[PDB]
Design an enzyme around this catalytic site. Structure first.
Site, PDB file in Angstrom:
ATOM      1  N   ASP A 264      -3.948  -5.837  -1.318  1.00  0.00           N
ATOM      2  CA  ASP A 264      -3.819  -6.928   0.116  1.00  0.00           C
ATOM      3  C   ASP A 264      -3.035  -6.906   1.353  1.00  0.00           C
ATOM      4  O   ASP A 264      -2.432  -7.631   2.326  1.00  0.00           O
ATOM      5  CB  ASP A 264      -3.877  -8.568  -0.576  1.00  0.00           C
ATOM      6  CG  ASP A 264      -2.191  -8.631  -1.062  1.00  0.00           C
ATOM      7  OD1 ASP A 264      -2.494  -9.470  -1.836  1.00  0.00           O
ATOM      8  OD2 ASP A 264      -1.592  -8.171  -0.851  1.00  0.00           O
TER       9      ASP A 264
ATOM     10  N   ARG B 261      -0.918  -8.647   6.041  1.00  0.00           N
ATOM     11  CA  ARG B 261      -1.118  -9.122   4.344  1.00  0.00           C
ATOM     12  C   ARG B 261      -1.970  -9.413   5.239  1.00  0.00           C
ATOM     13  O   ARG B 261      -2.608  -9.735   6.195  1.00  0.00           O
ATOM     14  CB  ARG B 261      -0.342  -9.926   4.283  1.00  0.00           C
ATOM     15  CG  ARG B 261      -0.206 -10.943   3.591  1.00  0.00           C
ATOM     16  CD  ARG B 261      -0.086 -10.255   2.135  1.00  0.00           C
ATOM     17  NE  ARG B 261      -0.444 -11.271   0.798  1.00  0.00           N
ATOM     18  CZ  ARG B 261      -1.401 -11.703   0.298  1.00  0.00           C
ATOM     19  NH1 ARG B 261      -2.500 -11.553   0.582  1.00  0.00           N
ATOM     20  NH2 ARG B 261      -0.476 -12.458  -1.042  1.00  0.00           N
TER      21      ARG B 261
ATOM     22  N   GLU C  46      -1.356  -7.893  -8.313  1.00  0.00           N
ATOM     23  CA  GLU C  46      -0.450  -7.078  -7.392  1.00  0.00           C
ATOM     24  C   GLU C  46       0.156  -5.403  -9.198  1.00  0.00           C
ATOM     25  O   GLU C  46      -0.060  -5.876  -9.504  1.00  0.00           O
ATOM     26  CB  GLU C  46       0.986  -7.764  -7.651  1.00  0.00           C
ATOM     27  CG  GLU C  46       0.462  -8.389  -5.953  1.00  0.00           C
ATOM     28  CD  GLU C  46       1.813  -9.132  -5.461  1.00  0.00           C
ATOM     29  OE1 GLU C  46       1.401 -10.718  -5.166  1.00  0.00           O
ATOM     30  OE2 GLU C  46       2.982  -8.185  -4.856  1.00  0.00           O
TER      31      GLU C  46
ATOM     32  N   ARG D  28       5.229  -9.745   8.270  1.00  0.00           N
ATOM     33  CA  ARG D  28       4.369  -8.388   8.216  1.00  0.00           C
ATOM     34  C   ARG D  28       2.570  -9.900   8.868  1.00  0.00           C
ATOM     35  O   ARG D  28       3.256 -11.167   8.917  1.00  0.00           O
ATOM     36  CB  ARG D  28       3.739  -9.340   6.397  1.00  0.00           C
ATOM     37  CG  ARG D  28       4.499  -8.188   6.010  1.00  0.00           C
ATOM     38  CD  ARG D  28       4.081  -8.534   4.262  1.00  0.00           C
ATOM     39  NE  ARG D  28       4.514 -10.040   3.837  1.00  0.00           N
ATOM     40  CZ  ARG D  28       4.350 -10.243   3.150  1.00  0.00           C
ATOM     41  NH1 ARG D  28       4.073  -9.028   2.197  1.00  0.00           N
ATOM     42  NH2 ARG D  28       3.375 -11.466   2.435  1.00  0.00           N
TER      43      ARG D  28
END
Length: 135
Positions: free
Chosen positions: A15, A29, A37, A81
């Site tokens: 992601d 993001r 993750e 991000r």
């Protein structure tokens, strides 16, 4: 909401991506989704982590055109991000991940929640089909 062009630099994981946007490298993001993750400090690789990462990477590397769509609220998170919906050839990557059972719909933060209902429909289909994260 409006789609703007961007170019891939590097896919970081399921992601998170580095794109070139308006002439500068920026990290993005993906809005409204959580992908398991790979680089998570606490308890290494999670299950479906490498798969979520391979799926986004493939989808973005093979695309003719990449577009970035900001929502109505803050456009960056606290880590700098970009927060966006990302499209590979007109197909939303955020939604494709949720549809394949490779992401859950995140806790939502008004007003960055424009595509929440659509993604919740896709997630409920992936749950119903028992895909990946849902098996």
């Amino acid at each position: 909401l409006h789609k703007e062009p961007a170019t891939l630099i590097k896919a970081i994981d399921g992601d998170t991506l580095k794109l070139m946007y308006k002439g500068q490298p920026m990290t993005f993001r993906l809005l409204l989704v959580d992908t398991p993750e790979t680089k998570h400090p606490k308890k290494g690789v999670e299950k479906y982590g490498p798969e979520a990462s391979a799926f986004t990477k493939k989808m973005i590397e093979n695309a003719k055109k990449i577009e970035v769509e900001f929502d109505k609220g803050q456009r960056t998170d606290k880590y700098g991000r970009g927060l966006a919906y990302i499209y590979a050839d007109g197909k939303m990557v955020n939604e494709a991940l949720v549809r394949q059972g490779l992401a859950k719909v995140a806790y939502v933060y008004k007003p960055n929640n424009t595509h929440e209902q659509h993604l919740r429909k896709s997630e409920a289909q992936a749950k119903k089909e028992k895909l990946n994260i849902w098996s």
